[PDB]
Amino acid sequence: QTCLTSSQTGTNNGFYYSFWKDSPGTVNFCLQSGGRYTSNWSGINNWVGGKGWQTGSRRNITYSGSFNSPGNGYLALYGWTTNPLVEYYVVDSWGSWRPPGSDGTFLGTVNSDGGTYDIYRAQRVNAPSIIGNATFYQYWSVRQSKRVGGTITTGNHFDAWASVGLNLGTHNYQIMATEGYQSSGSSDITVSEGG
Template sequence: MKKQHSFTSVTRKVTLVVAATMVFASATCLTGCKKDQKTAPETVASATPADKAAVTESYQSGTHNGFFWSLWKSDGATGTVNYANGTGGNYSVNWNGFNGNFTCGKGYSVGSATYKIGYNLSTYANSGGGTFGWYGWSRSPYYEYYVNETWGAVSPHTGTFLGTFETDGAGYNVWTRWMTGKDIDGGDGFRQIYSSRVTKTSTAQNHVITFANHYNKWKSYGYTLGQLNIPAIMVSETWGTNTNGNINCTIWAQ
């Protein structure tokens, strides 16, 4: 999580909304804008980190094996990012000498308060800031939400600490903060709400995120998510200067 900014930029937020809207218009492919159509989902899906750098426009998205996926890079970002969709809910990403902010991941074209997500994080290394976990947005009211399972060299924890609770065999700290940037529809200001594991998740083991438990805990503190008809993904993010890392993750519905 950036020190003073949201995980997202205005460009990414607006594009994500366009992408989410197009889900309802097309059951076969979801893309953020016309530029995204230059790289079809199948092209990215067949790439492997060793084969092909993900030379992208600012945002790409699509569907693969029944999952929604997306890859976003901040304007002016430099360095190499290689993203690949694997079998089923698997994806991988590696990056070298990266300057800026990127997010990527696999999930669903719309969020839900009742999702129960299984995941296995087989590899995680991140020399910069950023996080790995369940991520999405709501409208009415606008919330940017996270369930942080692990993070890079810079801690994402900031804002107002609300408390600690346990779910799925792990302790989570709950934080919130008001952001002065643009929401996903271009309006001014929005709130972040997030749960972060007290202890970072382990790799090469199966884990579960029962999102309803986080949703209800946030609600108990007075922060109730609004409409969730926006994509939600198991996100991998980094930000910083000259960062390096690699992540391999598989998700499934429990």
Template sequence: MKSNTFLSEVARRVTFCATIMLVATSSILSGCNKRSVAEPQTTTGDRQSGFVQDNAKPEDQGTVNGWFWSLYREGGSASITHGSGGNFAISYSNVNDVVGGKGWNPGSARTVGYNVGALSGSYNFVGVYGWTTSPLIEYYVAEMGSVTGGTYINSISSDGHSYSFYKQQRVNAPSIIGTATFWQYKDTWGGSSTGSNRSINMANHINNWRSRGGQGFGSYNYQILALEAWGGKSGYINATVW
């Protein structure tokens, strides 16, 4: 009986130790598995409009010497600096989307004067960019590059050029009032050049948008001479608006 009790005690202790080792091994392996799981990757949205995606850097804007300025950027890097009056410069590198420039808040049916003194690298659009509310409309007048897409409406003559008017609806896209559905009005000429004084009679564009756009034209929000670039572009602009 004494011998059998001893053997039973040995068996019990061996079983207990084996159980402890199994639990410990399972815990270690489980810990290794947690560390081996890849961290979630943050991705940015596709380019939608002049406004960047909700998960991108928020709006940066202000006033300097009585001039309104705005700069949006998604991905890469971008910065704006200001000279005297309506002069500004924007440098950008490897951006998913950047749109920025200088002008007024609110806008108006003014004649916009400008001179693009320097433009290098790659870009999509240089011209007048702005917004209205009630209805919410994002509008472009492309002096260099182009903004097309959507439905072609008509062409207008202004300042000695012929512009093609396109309109396009954006659904649940970033805007000046947050995510919203709105229309884009886009006039494209694209034949301007650097180093020359130019002018844009905004009344001609606005009157055509109001009568032919289908959504009218709302209350003015901001209006700037802007550059926009997207798709990993890098470059530099130095321009003056008046």
């Protein structure tokens, strides 16, 4: 295992990973065998990290494990595109606070992987991104009830987002992410693309 406590991207056991946190608190973000990582967080302001791919695609992404967020956290497929700069989520579970909140514009729903998801678009104006300080839209599929474990058929979400005018650019990274906000919690997630 390789345990990290501050921001880093890289590769581990054939998988890409991205891990980011601002200054407050502690994240113990530990890279295990295969597509597995664990996290715990405490007294943090905001952090997101996980394993996946350097270059996103329409691959079907399967994950399993635990997610424990008594306060504000997410368990989500998470990635970026450029041209347009987009930060996207397919949110399967969350903690105290269902995302994206009042900043989100509701656009409709998509049925995928035995769930229904609400589709939202939000905007970030002068915000930190994979290319630095920028203004970018976020695309959200958020499951109507929580789940921890299953397959995410990315094409279904990508196709549904497209039908509501949410354009995906050139894919950057694509990970099964844990996110915490002003809370404490843990997760233990294994990703793959072979069911």
